[PDB]
Amino acid sequence: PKISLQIPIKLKSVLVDDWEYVTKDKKICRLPADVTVEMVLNKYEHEVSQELESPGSQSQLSEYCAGLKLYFDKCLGNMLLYRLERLQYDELLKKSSKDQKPLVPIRIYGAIHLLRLISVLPELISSTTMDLQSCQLLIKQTEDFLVWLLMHVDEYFNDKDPNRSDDALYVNTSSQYEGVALG
Amino acid sequence: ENEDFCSACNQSGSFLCCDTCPKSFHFLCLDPPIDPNNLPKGDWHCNECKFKIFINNSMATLKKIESNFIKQNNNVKIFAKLLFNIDSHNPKQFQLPNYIKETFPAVKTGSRGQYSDE
Amino acid sequence: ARTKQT
Ligand SMILES: [Zn+2]
Ligand SMILES: [Zn+2]
C-alpha cells in the first residue's frame, strides 16, 4: 500500500521555492538558523499540548516530537541536503570538532530542513517493517503538525531573499563556494 | 570495478571508491564528508558495507540487533524502526518526491535534478 | 583507499 501524506499546498510551495533557491539560484540557508528545528518543535508541542485533555494524547504527542527531533538529527547529514549544501555542512562539522562537541542538527538547521524531512517520510516509512497502526499514527501526527505549521508560515518562511535583505533565511553563495561544492 | 558516478547524487567527478562493493562517492557527499587532503590510508567501506561488516561480526542476529534497539528506544517507540534503518543506508542527495513536484506543472526537473521553469 | 575520476 502506498503511504500518502497530505501536505498543504502552501507548504508544498515553500518546498518548491527551497528547491529553486538552492538548485537554480545557488543559495543556501543562513546557518545557524535564527529559528531552529528544536525551537519549532518546542513551540509546537507547548502550544498544542495545552489543548489536549487525554493523558494518552499528551504522551503520544511528546513521543512524536521527541522521536522526530532524534530522527532529524540522524537524517540531516545522510539524506536532507542538496549537493550544494554539503560544503557548508562539512564546515559545520569541522567547526564542531574544533569546539570538541558533537554537531546537533536540531540546534543548527531550521524549519525548511524539517519540512524537507517531512516530505520524504512516506518513502522512509515504506522502507521499514512498521506495522500499519504505527504508520497511521505517525502520518496523523505529522499532518497535525503541518496544520499548525501552515498557520505559522509567516513566522517561519518569510524574508527568504538575500537579494532583498542581509538578514534573510537564505544567503547567496560565491562562485568560489559553488565551484568547491559542485565541481 | 567501481562505478562511474556518485551513488549519492548521480553526478560525475572525483570519487572515493568502496572496497567491498562497486559504489563510488564524491568526498563531500559522504557522511561525514572525507577531506581529500587527509584520505584514509587503508581500505575504505561505504556506510552500507560498514553495516553488513558490523552485522556479520556480531554474535547476535540482525533481527535480534534490531529488537534490542527498539527496546532501547522505547521512549521514542514510533520512530524506533526509522532510526534503526538509518545506518544500513548510504547517504544520498535530498530530492523532493513526485507527489510534491507534480502539484506544480510549470516546473520541470533538469538533468542534474535542478529546478527549471523554462 | 582507492579513488576514481569520471
Ligand atoms: Zn555526489
Ligand atoms: Zn560498499
Domain ranges of chain B: 15-116
* Structural domain for A146, as ranges: 1-183
Give the number of domains in chain A.
1
B22 touches chain A (CB under 8 A): no
Residue ranges in B1-118 assigned as alpha helix (H): 47-56, 62-72, 80-85, 98-101
The amino acid at residue A19 is W
Question: Scanning every residue of chain B, which has its alpha carbon at the shortest distance from the alpha carbon of A139?
Answer: B78
Resolution of this deposited model, Å: 1.6
| Closest CA of chain B from A11, distance in Å | 10
Peptide bond before residue B32 is cis, with ω within 30 degrees of 0 = yes
Joined grid coordinates for residue A10: 502552501
Separation of alpha carbons A109 and B59, rounded Å: 38
- Chains with ≥3 Cβ pairs under 8 A against A? B
**Residue A96, helix vs strand vs coil:** helix
* Contact in structure between B40 and C1 (CB atoms under 8 Å): yes
Contact C6 B41 (CB under 8 A): no
Contact C5 B39 (CB under 8 A): no
Separation of alpha carbons B47 and B31, rounded Å: 8
Give me the residues paired with residue B116 across strands. Answer: B108
